[PDB]
Design an enzyme around this catalytic site. Structure first.
Site, PDB file in Angstrom:
ATOM      1  N   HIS A   1     -17.609 -54.452  62.459  1.00  9.98           N
ATOM      2  CA  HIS A   1     -18.843 -54.558  63.241  1.00  9.98           C
ATOM      3  C   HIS A   1     -19.364 -53.188  63.670  1.00  9.98           C
ATOM      4  O   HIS A   1     -20.174 -53.104  64.600  1.00  9.98           O
ATOM      5  CB  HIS A   1     -18.691 -55.438  64.500  1.00  9.98           C
ATOM      6  CG  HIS A   1     -18.154 -56.816  64.257  1.00  9.98           C
ATOM      7  ND1 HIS A   1     -18.972 -57.920  64.128  1.00  9.98           N
ATOM      8  CD2 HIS A   1     -16.882 -57.283  64.198  1.00  9.98           C
ATOM      9  CE1 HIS A   1     -18.226 -59.003  63.972  1.00  9.98           C
ATOM     10  NE2 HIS A   1     -16.955 -58.644  64.012  1.00  9.98           N
TER      11      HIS A   1
ATOM     12  N   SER B   1     -30.483 -27.239  54.378  1.00  4.89           N
ATOM     13  CA  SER B   1     -31.615 -26.723  55.126  1.00  4.89           C
ATOM     14  C   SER B   1     -31.170 -25.530  55.964  1.00  4.89           C
ATOM     15  O   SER B   1     -30.122 -25.572  56.618  1.00  4.89           O
ATOM     16  CB  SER B   1     -32.170 -27.822  56.026  1.00  4.89           C
ATOM     17  OG  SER B   1     -32.948 -27.270  57.061  1.00  4.89           O
TER      18      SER B   1
END
Lengths: 459, 461, 459, 461
Positions: free
Chosen positions: D188, D318
């Site tokens: 979960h 980046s």
């Protein structure tokens, strides 16, 4: 009118005349989404899973005989249809199916307590977690129930109906083996074939689909039970997983086995994604068969009209002679449904994370629906339409003999050039092939009747 | 060419073909994503070039980029738009999910070419720089979504909508031309109450008119541009006027109503505008499937189908199927309509799969979206010119089917009563007779009465 | 126990305690496919359609006042929930919905006969075809009921719940507008933004979806009623189509209009294909919002853990501290369902032939299900999760300040070279940015605290 | 080239480029179906060439085709297979739905080229004829489905299955290498009972093994070939041994187990084998999506995600995101998995849409099917070599998460009892402490006892 049931979060009021407990009540209050509930097949599969788990826990000395027997007795009552209103929960619940697992644990515990001379509620003699859920996790119970329900539905409903429909169409193919009719390719008139040959294509499609469905069964037969919470089986007896699969195989008479890799069994719905692939294949085949039937039956006067089908419901009083292909319509509609269900299943199956796939209620809701639709649809189409397909022999012959397509039988007698000339003249001037040939003086009427034999053009 | 040029990025040096204008980041993407054959479509490459051209213009306006460099970048971008550099964009759809690598492909090609336009060279001695100059004020995260929307909006406005309008006009002309031709209706595939061929075609026209409205409703959201949100949507490291200015410049140079997205977080984290716009395209696909199927079924024949209309015959038929005319435009159109339905599912999955500040399913989403636009626009164009403009009724066949049907019997109700009319239709159906032959056999009317009373032109409203 | 009811095909036994007639009984016996039935919304829309038709037929002098009033009274009983068990038919029936049209005609006629002092059955005083179906065809009634049900469900259930959820998230966005947190792009640490800004993205998504849904409403408001069997309106009064749309607009208070082209209205389900396109857009947006919530709440210790959500059900006793995002799971599951439903709808909508689309029961079954799922799902997610979203401020700050991402604030003070050197050293040696900067001697602690201000990095 | 050559068919004459080898029917299809950019893939072109090569061989065996012509057709087909004629196949996917036009493209190119190989010329003076020679004993209706299955079976056997096996082997090696590394479980998305990294990876391995079996189950049906059914399935106008002989010849030259379809009506009227086989491919797509997502989530970081594994960094990141490594292979793979799901829907619609004797959605079906095979094969190849072979644990981070979690508390149950263990976990959770700090604060054990009792290596079975 109500009683107080408790879980680790506290107390909550439950209807006095119901058998569920605190966790079922919380789910009922917090997941009020739409109208879809667990189907009966899945409730029964959950009860079978608990029945098998109780038997194995007793065999291993982990659960008393009186408790294990009472749990099995309560489970048999669920399977016998005595408790359908005790399972009120939505499909749209927790993604592991915990809430439906607890629904079964609570109903079985409260009922088994009564079977042992006790009461339902917090004074119960059998306990949902420590007794009914012993050795188990929602994480391995729910996928087990999914596969039990799926395999049994395929074996007991879908495959028998597929075989029955195939047998009917095979009989029709043999009965109509000599009836020559016009072919159609691109919707255009084409080389002849027999009605029996065309139906033999439908039969071969259904035989191929049976094989594809059968190939999907071994993976569905693998059960997660025994992987417990994350797949390692921590806290279980080392024989438990094999023993519970064996017991499920005994009580269902189906070849269930324990999943060789419990991590795959908990983290995915892969067996059902694959099995549903075979079902959407069947839907595509049935769509084509149903469309051929309704187009071949179209009429009474401005369609094709080569076959007749049973008229089972009154027609429209303002459409004289029309017989709507209503079984074909129900079947084509449910085939669209199966295609959409496949997409929902594929998205859920692609969306597992780490140790557990939590799209399970939605996956099984769609899968079991597709099985019901295809099994019941094949039954309905068989009984109310396929068994009654009959040829309209005069119409078949009229279309065939007034077509241009029999002209190829003239090639070997007068040459392809004049045979092509005959076909073009007939087409241009709106004549039969025979009339155009006689007008051109390329043969006599006796020659045409001797040379143009459709029964020799279907080999 | 075998000879190489060494290009550099922050990872080091890599060899690129000497005769190409791209740089190190393009080469790495080319080498590392050898997946299938789908590449960025020309429409997207052009949209990226337009985005860089507008960004350079605004950077110059704001004093952030020299006039010399901004003009050279504009000239290089115009060369891309003029079709001079298609082989400079070798990257796959199946690359990084932000489209960063194609952003860098444009930055590197434009920088190397702009350097040449300023009298410099390509490669590491270049006078214009891919990151510091061509990507100034921008992020891959905001450039690629901007190019997606520029390409999508221009394709809808310039290709799809004009072809939709053209096909609609053709079918409207046909509906008017055939307004007086009564034919048999068909419901459930069964013979039904008559309508005119013009009325039936008017349904196709109304479908295409409704579809145009739905497509138009989706355009304002596609017109919202992410440019200016930078890396995560906040606009950090950009001039506060840049977002508005670049959207305005794109609107000027494209003549389309681009605006800056009012919420840059929605603009970067989702492909929602394209999910919604593609919903309208799958609607059009369902409508075109129905129209194409009506045409091919109505043309089916030559003798064992319906045969109420004829269509142009454009490719030779099979030598062994005399008189058959395959409805090939209808087949291409029905096939591409299935494709659009599948493309919608792929788009929906990508659109549902954003995480946090960025959706990284973007190359796949735009690949599918622009494909659906090409298919629907070119498919309508082809179906119109090679089929729709030449649809003609087969008047004698239409009348044969109508007159031999049972459906005209209701015209007798007012003259002889429902009970005798029903008796006539039942006898005709049971005995294989026309309504007229059954009515005469029972003695319920004369031939002249049947011809005077049974008037299909009075049964269509 | 039974009575004999008749149609044009003959007599059939119907339960004495039921109000339906011969055609409903035949459908019940011949279309026994799965478990899906017409939803209550569609039954109510069918009753409203008959109520409006009776009123207009009376206004036009075609139906007596006593019959028209009795029919309207019987229809009001259906709308008031008195007759839910009188509509037993499957979705998987004839593709035009004829059988459900006749179900309403028969129940209303038999009940209206009782309201006039008569009986149910063949001695009835009100007649299903000549009275209840007067001026109508199944072909135009069923698509009218489809659009009535669809438009009312969108207006009365889905749009209110969408607005309610948007308002909650808008309040949360404003409450958390100052809380700076780490960005995430590609799942990697990224430039900061505020929690309020991130939530503002969810809000803007829901606002855009509302607009797209609203744009779909005018086409759904167009009604087929008055096109009769093939779209020409043959045998109807020329004012009937406008009058019945006007009456439906009066009694529902919704802006129904008559479809300007009845051929499009009968031959397609295009309005619903288009409207469902907006619903699958909403499903994609809700999937992303629900996933952000559960990932941001993941933990308690080995996930992200930036927000907390309400714990509404007891957790697993062996997973201490875990709070399963159960509302998020139900919501992501139903979003997959909507995507599959869209495919089924698209196939049905693409499959019309000539004057009539006969995939209608399946199309409306899917469409109305998607509306229930999205409306109820948004209600549940709002009440049980969204209203209770709270930040874990200490965890947010720990992640932000221990990240490498605040290093860009040093560029303007010490230069990009040394700022990059600081970030690489911190990354390589497992230090904070401040510790790496102090180790290199590039600044003092006072300078770092003055220069590195996350609150100045979100503009 | 501007100069043209006049080519003829039964419809008349049409100009084709003088430097091309196709004929009149190809040119008409090229001109009339200017729809988008998707063309027949090279795999399908090759499968068509193999089909013609086998057909010519059998025609020669049966005395129906001269040795001279059969050898020239074989040589021309081998040139196609060797990559010498890719630009001779210009036709769109969006053509006639039977693929007749691409059948004629192969007939015309092979005839014109075989004529040259015999010392003749291309064009209407050719010595080898597209219909009478290259298409002898065949129909478009049976050739195109045959090429579809030849292309599909060879792509599955030669590309997809080997790459699936390779990725499976890599992950099996990783599962063995990491068999002793205990990590936190996640159910979960919440912390859960521990398992080893090797156990978690073993789930990925088992998924890929199951997928291989499902794909293998689909191969026998794809191996059934329509060739010999001719126009409608009856085999009218072909030698009674042709169907078996040509399937046998295709099996010899491809080393794949092709057989003649036992029912030619099913073979011509449906695409059922490909609908079913693609069902197994969308299963693989769902499995790969899950594996790819596990990898990128487990690698998320560098500091604010999970960070339990590292992956190779192949393209520069980046400049403004220090330390970030974008999981670019995972992004390409998840994108192509969405594509396969959409392709399945398009295939299902085409497969459901046959009428009577022929399914005419075939170019679209095979376009999607072969694309999914390229995507899955090349995607697994790329993911394996650029990501999977280099996955490594971050052992200190794995231990940090495990030791700071609440999940090890169950190891205390047998030593101090469930009640005190539960009290420790509740205190730790409420007060933000480690389990050890909470246990020591309550005085329930010593530090040495905690270290001796709480052993993750004993909690994974």
């Amino acid at each position: 009118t109500v009683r107080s049931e408790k879980d680790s979060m506290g107390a909550i009021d439950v209807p006095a005349d119901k058998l569920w407990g605190a966790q079922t009540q919380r789910s009922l209050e917090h997941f009020r989404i739409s109208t879809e509930k667990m189907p009966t097949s899945l409730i029964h599969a959950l009860a079978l899973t608990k029945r098998a788990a109780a038997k194995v826990n007793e065999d291993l000395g982990l659960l008393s005989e009186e408790k294990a027997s009472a749990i099995r007795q309560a489970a048999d009552e669920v399977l016998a249809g005595q408790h359908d209103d005790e399972f009120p929960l939505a499909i749209w619940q927790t993604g592991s199916g915990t809430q439906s697992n607890m629904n079964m644990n609570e109903v079985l515990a409260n009922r088994a307590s009564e079977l042992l001379g006790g009461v339902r509620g917090m004074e119960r003699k059998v306990h949902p977690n420590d007794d009914v859920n012993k050795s188990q996790s929602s994480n391995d119970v729910f996928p087990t129930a999914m596969h039990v329900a799926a395999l049994l539905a395929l074996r007991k409903q879908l495959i028998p109906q597929l075989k029955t429909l195939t047998q009917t169409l095979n009989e029709k193919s043999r009965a109509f083996a000599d009836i020559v009719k016009i072919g159609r390719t691109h919707l255009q008139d084409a080389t002849p074939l027999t009605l029996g040959q065309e139906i033999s294509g439908w039969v071969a499609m259904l035989e191929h689909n049976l094989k594809h469905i059968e190939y999907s069964l071994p993976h569905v037969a693998e059960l997660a039970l025994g992987g417990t919470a994350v797949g390692t089986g921590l806290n279980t007896h080392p024989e438990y997983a094999r023993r519970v699969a064996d017991e499920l195989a005994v009580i269902t008479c189906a070849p269930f086995v324990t999943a060789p890799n419990k991590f795959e069994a908990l983290a995915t719905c892969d067996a059902l994604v694959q099995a549903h692939g075979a079902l959407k294949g069947l839907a595509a085949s049935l769509m084509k068969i149903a469309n051929d039937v309704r187009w071949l039956a179209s009429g009474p006067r401005c369609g094709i009209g080569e076959i007749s089908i049973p008229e089972n419901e009154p027609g429209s009083s303002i459409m004289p002679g029309a017989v709507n292909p209503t079984q074909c319509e129900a079947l084509t509609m449910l085939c669209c449904q199966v295609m959409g269900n496949d997409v929902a299943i594929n998205m859920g199956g692609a969306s597992g994370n780490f140790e557990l796939n939590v799209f399970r209620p939605m996956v099984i809701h769609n899968f079991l629906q597709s099985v019901r639709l295809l099994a019941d649809g094949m039954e309905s189409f068989n009984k109310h339409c396929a068994v009654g397909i009959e040829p309209n022999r005069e119409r078949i012959n009229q279309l065939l003999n007034e077509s241009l397509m029999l002209v190829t039988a003239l090639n070997t007698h007068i040459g392809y050039d004049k045979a092509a000339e005959i076909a073009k003249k007939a087409h241009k001037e709106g004549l039969t092939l025979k009339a155009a040939a006689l007008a051109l003086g390329y043969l006599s009427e006796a020659e045409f009747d001797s040379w143009v034999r459709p029964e020799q053009m279907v080999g």
